Amino acid sequence: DIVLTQSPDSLAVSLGERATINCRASESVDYSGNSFMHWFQQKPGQPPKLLIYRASNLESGIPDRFSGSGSRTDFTLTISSLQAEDVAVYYCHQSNEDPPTFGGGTKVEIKRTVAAPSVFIFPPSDEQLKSGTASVVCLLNNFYPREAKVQWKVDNALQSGNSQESVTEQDSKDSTYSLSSTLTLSKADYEKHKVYACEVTHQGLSSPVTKSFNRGEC
């Protein structure tokens, strides 16, 4: 099988600057003066989108900042002026020899200015509490860079082993990340305590910020 090796594996690029992605093949992907190497863009929860076919041909509807070159075993995708919406995983694809094969992918991220998270806290719904579980959600919205710390406090007692985190990939407009932290208690343990707080530490905050509620809830 033809093995496709991409480089870099990932890169962080500033708005308006050049992204270069190389694909090398273990064998020639040319036949009769035609190169059967193609380039795809994949965003999260979306299929691959064709950018370039047969090494250098820009697909209809794809902006001209995307271009391709190379032949035989050496190919390059160039994004001349990287835009916010170009954050994705990029794949090379050879169709010269069976089976068709893809590269391992190249992750393109925007490097942008530091942005503080907007913090929100959500008490468990009355609906859920009747089921006998309490989910407390802390939302960190629209921050850069990715690195963040969430600390759960229950009556000022710092929590451990009973939370899970999830992070979005980089937003296609403002190049930020968002994060949700969920604290999971039994209804029993939830009702033993009053003050629920999530403490957010991040580069964009001068000191850690705390959002909290009382189980009383107005």
């Binding site: 076919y53 068709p100 590269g103 859920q128 939302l139 999830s166 949700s180 509620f213 107005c218």
Partner: protein
């Protein structure tokens, strides 16, 4: 406009047969080939096989023993059958229109996630993440579903700006959970209606949950 759409069972038991259908529009299966490509979660793309325009098949040799691709030109449909499935066959399965002379896969379906698992299918419970108190956040918690995936829209796709739907987390129970949030004007919380549309295709569950202040 060229469109493809994959349909699949969601969950398949080990050693059983995976059956998928790819329905096409905006082109004829007499003119174009259709390829099947899968992507295990957080991994690369693996080509399975192609149905040629003329009705012949070409397969990845690693799947020769287990894989059959068929079609009906007149029903605008290509089918995949993968026998003796294991955990290794857990992936998003894609069908793609292929240019017959060049092998260029120019249009792809949205994909269908196939989970190979001995566990039961289970539709989600949907709970509101209510706003409290310029900017206000609200959302929906989609709890205790299996397998993946869940999709969330807001006001049937009318609300998209400020929407964040987070990757699902696997809880210790072995059931998935995810949150979907949207940031809105604080002044809008009193007046404006906010409904999350939760779709769990593997259980054929659709849940609408109105989200409002406490």
């Amino acid at each position: 406009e060229v469109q493809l759409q994959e349909s699949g069972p969601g969950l398949v038991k080990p050693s059983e047969t995976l059956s998928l259908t790819c329905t096409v529009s905006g082109f004829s299966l007499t003119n174009y080939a259709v390829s099947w490509v899968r992507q295990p979660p957080g991994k690369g793309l693996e080509w399975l096989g192609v149905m040629w325009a003329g009705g012949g098949t070409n397969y990845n040799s690693v799947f020769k023993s287990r894989l059959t691709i068929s079609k009906d030109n007149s029903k605008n449909q290509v089918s995949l059958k993968l026998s003796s499935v294991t955990a290794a066959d857990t992936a998003v399965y894609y069908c793609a229109r292929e240019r017959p002379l060049t092998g260029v896969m120019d249009y792809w379906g949205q994909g269908t996630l196939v989970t190979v698992s001995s566990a039961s299918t289970k539709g989600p419970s949907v709970f509101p993440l209510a706003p409290s108190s310029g900017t206000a956040a609200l959302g929906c918690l989609v709890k205790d579903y299996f397998p993946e995936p869940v999709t969330v829209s807001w006001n049937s796709g009318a609300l998209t700006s400020g929407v964040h739907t987070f990757p699902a987390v696997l809880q210790s129970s072995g059931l998935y959970s995810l949150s979907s949030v949207v940031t809105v004007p604080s002044s809008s919380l009193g007046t404006q209606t906010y409904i999350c549309n939760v779709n769990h295709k593997p259980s054929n569950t659709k849940v609408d949950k109105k989200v409002e202040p406490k």
